[PDB]
Design a protein around this ligand. Structure first.
Ligand SMILES: *C/C=C(C)/C=C/C=C(C)/C=C/C1=C(C)CCCC1(C)C
Length: 137
């Protein structure tokens, strides 16, 4: 597959519920949900190496990794973690995360390229799964 692209969000479900599990208070959850309404994901993929830039209106972050090699990023609620991405199939990868310090919910994410040109991101905290769908810009 080629995940490369400038991806624009078209749907976001269960994001507030995810943030609630992660301990974010109500007003900030609503504000974060609003920022997700228009956010972008830019992917450059070369073989098993990924460069990912996630951007909202006022914030941008980069996530760089090679599949199967541990790296450091942050959880959704911003806690530093160690991460490891593996393929689950031709067009889907899964990332397991472990907190660098302390305890907290078990978090992870997945990225899938569908056959109709959508990118599906999921983000999980314990029992709660957020699903977001993007198309290429
Ligand atoms: C592989 C693609 C990944 C890991 C995308 C991750 C995206 C996020 C962690 C998005 C986080 C956001 C917040 C934590 C609040 C502001 C809105 C978002 C959706 C940009």
């Amino acid at each position: 597959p080629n995940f490369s692209g400038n991806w624009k969000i078209i749907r976001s479900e269960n994001f507030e519920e995810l943030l609630k599990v992660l301990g974010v208070n109500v007003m900030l959850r609503k504000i974060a949900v609003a920022a997700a309404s228009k956010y972008a994901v830019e992917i450059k993929q070369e073989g098993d190496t990924f460069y990912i830039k996630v951007s909202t209106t006022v914030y941008t972050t980069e996530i760089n990794f090679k599949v199967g090699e541990e790296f450091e990023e942050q959880t959704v609620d911003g806690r530093p973690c160690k991460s490891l991405v593996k393929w689950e199939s031709e067009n889907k990868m899964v990332c397991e995360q472990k907190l660098l310090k302390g305890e907290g919910p078990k978090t992870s994410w997945t990225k899938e390229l569908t056959n109709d040109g959508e990118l599906i991101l999921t983000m999980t905290a314990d029992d709660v799964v957020c699903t977001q769908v993007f198309v290429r810009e």
